[PDB]
Design an enzyme around this catalytic site. Structure first.
Site, PDB file in Angstrom:
ATOM      1  CG  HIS E  50      -0.508   0.336   2.478  1.00 15.28           C
ATOM      2  ND1 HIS E  50      -0.533  -0.546   3.535  1.00 15.28           N
ATOM      3  CD2 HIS E  50       0.047   1.476   2.954  1.00 15.28           C
ATOM      4  CE1 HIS E  50      -0.011   0.031   4.603  1.00 15.28           C
ATOM      5  NE2 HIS E  50       0.351   1.257   4.277  1.00 15.28           N
ATOM      6  CG  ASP E  81      -0.201  -4.201   2.374  1.00  9.05           C
ATOM      7  OD1 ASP E  81      -0.048  -3.667   1.254  1.00  9.05           O
ATOM      8  OD2 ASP E  81      -0.234  -3.536   3.425  1.00  9.05           O
ATOM      9  CB  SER E 159       3.171  -0.018   8.168  1.00  8.67           C
ATOM     10  OG  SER E 159       2.575   0.673   7.095  1.00  8.67           O
TER      11      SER E 159
END
Lengths: 4, 20, 464, 463, 463, 464, 20, 4
Positions: E50, E81, E159
């Site tokens: 993402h 992801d 992240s």
């Protein structure tokens, strides 16, 4: 005070 | 003066007033 | 053993009477709040300035001692949020084993914060790591100083108690205002600066700024155009007129070194062995009055210059200088200097775009400059038509540009003329008759009603 | 014969497609709306300008008829929010009895608004009195004009239908967007709009004096100015683009206007015993009219003449329909700051300084624009300047920018090594001209875009 | 040697430009974001998918270095992801010491996440323990995978940075969007993603059994099914596109999976004494793996073999990057229903029936799409069909539609007099073919548009 | 004189005990509300049905009479929101001068609404005009009947009193539920329909529907394709299986005339001299059982057909048929029919997409059909694993498709089998053991706890 | 059945169930 | 009921  | 944005808090990205 | 350390931590009771800025012949409502402090040695207690802010009285309580003692505020830095307290006496300080100041931690170093939560008689503790070492702001819009982020949340009552190593040294002071799980700590280095500031000058001289508005040079063409070699330097966009720079720097200068440390594309600079730090940090480690050597590229040419560093001059101040805000009333026309607190208290509207920008975007053109505003008009037969006038900046009085409110006050008193002529920002003009204004004086402040036409500081004589 | 009057009131279906003001090679999402219109005579339908605003298609529907028809918008006054519509059928107009326009009502006069509420496609009616007659604000397009308030609330689908006398004359046009407060545009405004368009074959717009005024309610203030009586208003500022800047001066006191005495408040005699805002007089003139103004300057009485023209807006509400102007130049997207642009993104990401310039600053000359960088389309050439949104740009290679066309011209003529843009903060973006010209296709063949200009910027520029 | 470990953790600057899913000839407003990535070896950077999603440009920045660099996205697994990045410098990688991947932690194990919080561009650290190990949900892209929870909250900019052992091994990837609850993608998932890509030179994705399961916690239920012990799960439904539809049947009870006993709850032995969701097993296989399944069918024990493939989604989350497909045809804009489309307009104007089909219905065959009319661009030909938004279309001239490519083909071949579209409600729109073909240019030279198709729909169609 | 009219208006006191649908062995909380009614002649009082809805007791008070009297509800139409009341006696009715029903008003006709506001002992009045004559809905999602809009707002307590001409005739009944300034009125014509319905059948038979789903034909090509001349007709998209149409109409039919009135592009139709009206209006003016002649275009051909019109059959009902909702409990598994009130009370979630759509998008396939849901499971050793199951539709029982809840109830009682097998919508299957379920019966409803396994209506015998 | 939107209140534009 |  106004613009005219 | 004027045309600044004098506080480093209300500006952002790559425009910063330098100091403490 | 271990509990000896917690015995150096103290609970802080403080009664707060702030002034009302909206109506500055008055004070806000008196309340009591709590906080934390600790023994740093000598006869001194360390705390946050916001704990003792506007102190009517300040009391401190030892851990495991029922009696409260009474403390005095020696000195307070507002922008680093630190305050020192003295205590009397001789019982409180009995058998006290104060804390020593540690050096600056490394990321992931274990930290514990010790303090007194809001409510309850008992001391509390939180443990985490140093998550972040960054430059941040310690007071709204005020300044930017080094700070330590920790992995644990902090109770408001818990600032300004100590933040500890695992070796028992204090690595800074906890800071919480009153959705994070991130606590803040004023580091030892900012604390040292404060203490030596105080030892040297016997009063708080603050943290200097370079007085300059910088642009990052990431873009190739910029750098090529400016004749900057490799990847280094920040472009000088603007200078503050009240700072020694601007006699020294110019728009288009690329600062390259500072005290012979090289400055990169972004603002950073060598810090400690594996680390870099925002250029601001070096600037902040100086003292008011200090000179820094600055490597510059002007035109295409390397050049060295010296700059005096002084604390920022705020046209619209955050701090008020403590005490009570100035005011003067003429013909029921109430004047005060524009300040952040005033804005805060009047909130967003009734302030207005024109004025708000001036407060955000404008710099002092000379020392002592203020924006003088007409906040309200207290209705009366001399001011008819001028009522309903709120938060307007006054520019001229009887033709004369107003430098600050002491100036305005000096001009009123020297005025023998027929009319009092006030030109405001809109180009709006209020004209009043001198003699009638005076006759109305007692009647207006009686009816509204207000103790005095002035605040004391404006009775004083005016200079230049 | 009552149902006769209703039969002139038509329902208006309209599909709006507006421009995206950020990237004006695109359009926003079309939506359909309904409103009202009525027959004023000739082949003409009267309605609200906003009802047809940015119309892709307009349909009208007669009462007691299922069929829609196709209307074309003939002319739109924006500042009075009025529009004329035509329909080609010979159906439709078959058996039509258009409305007669009545005179301006007096307070407590009975009024019925007729229109089509949203949904159901059946006609509706409300009745009230005329509660208020005042100079009010129009469509945040601002020009202040006479207006009527009514005791009755009006459904959004009802404006632009007619407001009626009890004699069955139309006294004005229902105006509502989205109280128990109705707003009606009165016949005299309508009338003005028609005679304007009847000349010129197009809408010129209401004029203004171009002057910024302070009332004098304070006796001290008057004495100081040597005003004889209590009357007059004080001139604080004069718009540079107005004819008044050559005639009036800051400090003047205006006293009469075409021999009507201006009161020390902002007033003026209205009709019979009533009083109305000075603005009413100016508004009842036409562009190019000359007005004679009484003034007190210093202490002395004077007489001057001013030509009257529609206000020249530095930041426009209107946008003049269709596509707004833009540049690009290496991913930097340049457009004029406009009021419609100011709400897409609404207020944020614009910033205090811009917003204030938009609410305050006036044109120094005809055609001046505040030119902004809306956004930057990321790409190798612009690396470091991405982010960088909604920033007024001042100079290009040292040259002050007059407007976006001026800017399009300076760039076409450049030939220099770098393109240098100085913005509001003294923030400066520098680009390599060759690299930019070479990245053009890639940038708009990527991002991706019809062209590097809005079509108007191709035309040769002026001075 | 601590600062050595941090030096592998890089800050990620990314500019996203996504498609407008309503009119996918346009793009939404680009924005920039930051995130984290770290060095896994070779020339490769590991990060969150993402973080680079719909990237126009990606920059990475080393710790204690001011310069940004240019990264290219090498491969993106969407369902886990995860993303790999490369950078060409020989700066950058100069003096690099990449991370070693550690094994899956046990509860109460110490963890430190390292990354760059939003703003300030200085690195950060948090410490906690491993609070939970579970099969959890991934990026609403859903494929359920093993996941770690930590005692520590994580900043959105952290992240996709690494989560560390106390031995300095990377145990997984920080995952956060926008508690005191951290989420980490564990090494085994990462590992899976790498070996997948190491073959094929591309990401195939995690497979699934293609089966809908009921636990049996009820003794009565088991007796009825003649289950020997309490173990097994019951097959309610089988996806048609899965290999299981040729092997498994509704009513079967699955008992072992590659000789692991499935519990009467949904479980399975995990490691040592632990138990994990059955989904864990399936997930640890690769597309094309054959699994052996124990079942009880009728009352009798059986053994079957199923090939495992990634779930075939009727309504996709992914969109496969870049431009989504579309038609037009006389102002009617046709696209595939997708999950990303479902939030632009979010939930409304979609409607109950559509939303439910998106949450429930499964593909009857590979390549099936739910084709919708997003909107209608008003024009003479389509009069009466405007409005008309977000409606699934079923037949075209009597022919059931398989997908949007099928639809593009039927239209190209048409030649008939009318174009007849039957939609979800049995609502039917009929258009004159000639009039449509003649209005084409006007409609997209107006509205206005690059072309009448998305480029893929030009290619010849299949069967 | 004038005040004689107001003397026909009455205040309505009503005590409301509704059933709880979520738990339908129980009733909701008892409260009292107020409303309006008026004398229409004979011994009858007119009001809104919602005023007397779920009436425990109903009391009425004359204007200027301290004593309350006691009223009975003769008949109530739910979808037109009308109720008639009778009163006893002989004192109340003394010297009463009832209201006569006027014909339907024209737009702009003056109207006054008379009623009793919430609170206070006094009658109130509002005047306005008839703003709109349109077809609307009188009960949520129920039906569409003619209605009059007025230019004046109405107090909730003010429905169901009279709406007057300037001639003193009542032109309808006020309607307010409890940002508009628009009041609603049930017109005389809808009222007449109700009264004659009642005289003829001695009970409420409702307002019929054509049972058809229509599409407007605005588009040229549509009309050309369908071979529809000029501008007329609506396309038949769908038919209700329980309606006599669908034996008569088909998808692709264009209805053209209705009782020899032509139907346009949109739905409208000649109404009164200058006016048109939605096609629905004609349909609504019929009575249950009536036949309408309908001009159709099928293929390309004009054709005439007859259709029986009956009131809509709602698979998921709004009205419950009054009284108490059915329920049956097996092994702690609690079943009820899905209804709008149940949905309303359980709110939005816990209902769920699949089920919600069925309630919005689905039609009855035959008379008497219901959607039977399992609302909750009352936990117990027989149902282990089945707890936590909420709002699920049951499809089959022991292989048999469930027609309605009486059917399900008949199947449970006839079941001698080993297991009770319930197949739900997800394809989820609950299996239970018959004998153990029975043993648990008393224990489960004791503990939870509930009076009865059923609601009375399911003890009754089952048919076909 | 299904694929309808049975209430005239939850549908709109040009799809309407006809009756009272 | 879970998809696997």
């Amino acid at each position: 005070x106004x613009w005219x | 003066x004027x045309x600044x944005x004098x506080x480093x808090x209300x500006x952002x990205x790559x425009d910063x007033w330098x100091x403490x | 053993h271990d509990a000896s350390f917690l015995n150096a931590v103290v609970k802080v009771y403080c009664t707060h009477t702030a002034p009302d800025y909206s109506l500055p012949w008055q004070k806000q409502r008196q309340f009591t709040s709590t906080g934390s402090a600790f023994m740093i040695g000598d006869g001194k207690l360390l705390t946050n300035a916001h704990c003792v802010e506007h102190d009517t009285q300040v009391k401190v309580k030892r851990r495991g001692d029922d009696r409260k003692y009474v403390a005095k505020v020696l000195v307070r830095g507002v922008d680093c949020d630190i305050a020192l307290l003295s205590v009397e006496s001789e019982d409180f300080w009995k058998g006290a084993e104060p804390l020593r100041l540690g050096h600056l931690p490394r990321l992931q170093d274990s930290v514990t914060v010790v303090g007194y939560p809001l409510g309850g008689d008992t001391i509390s503790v939180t443990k985490g790591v140093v998550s972040r070492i960054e430059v941040t702001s310690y007071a709204h819009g005020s300044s930017d100083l080094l700070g330590i982020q920790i992995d644990a949340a902090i109770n408001p009552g818990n600032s300004g108690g100590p933040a500890f190593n695992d070796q028992g040294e204090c690595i800074g002071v906890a800071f919480q205002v009153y959705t994070e799980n991130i606590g803040y700590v004023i580091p030892t280095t900012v604390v040292s600066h404060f203490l030596t500031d105080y030892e040297r000058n016997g009063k708080y001289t603050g943290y200097p700024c370079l007085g300059v508005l910088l642009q990052k040079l990431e873009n190739p063409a910029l750098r090529e155009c400016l004749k900057v070699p490799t990847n280094e330097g920040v472009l000088v966009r603007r200078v503050e007129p009240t700072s020694d720079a601007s006699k020294v720097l110019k728009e288009g200068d690329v600062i390259v070194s500072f005290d012979d440390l090289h400055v990169g594309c972004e603002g950073t600079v060598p810090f400690r062995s594996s680390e870099r730090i925002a250029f601001r940090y070096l600037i902040s480690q100086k003292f008011a009055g200090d000179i820094a050597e600055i490597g510059i590229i002007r035109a295409g040419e390397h050049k060295k210059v010296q700059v005096v560093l002084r604390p920022r001059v705020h046209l619209v101040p955050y701090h008020i200088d403590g005490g009570q805000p100035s005011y003067i009333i003429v013909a029921g026309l109430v004047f005060t200097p524009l300040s952040e607190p005033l804005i805060e208290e009047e909130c967003e509207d009734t302030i207005g775009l024109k004025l708000l920008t001036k407060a955000r975007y404008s710099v002092a053109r000379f020392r002592g400059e203020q924006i003088v505003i007409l906040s309200q008009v207290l209705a009366n037969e001399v001011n008819i038509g001028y009522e309903d006038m709120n938060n307007q900046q006054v520019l001229k009085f009887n033709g004369i540009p107003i430098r600050n409110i002491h100036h305005l006050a000096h001009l009123i008193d020297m005025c023998k003329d027929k009319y009092l002529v006030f030109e405001f920002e809109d180009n709006y003009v209020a004209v009043l008759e001198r003699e009638a204004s005076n006759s109305a004086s007692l009647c207006i402040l009686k009816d509204y009603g207000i103790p005095s036409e002035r605040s004391a500081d404006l009775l004083e004589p005016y200079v230049d």
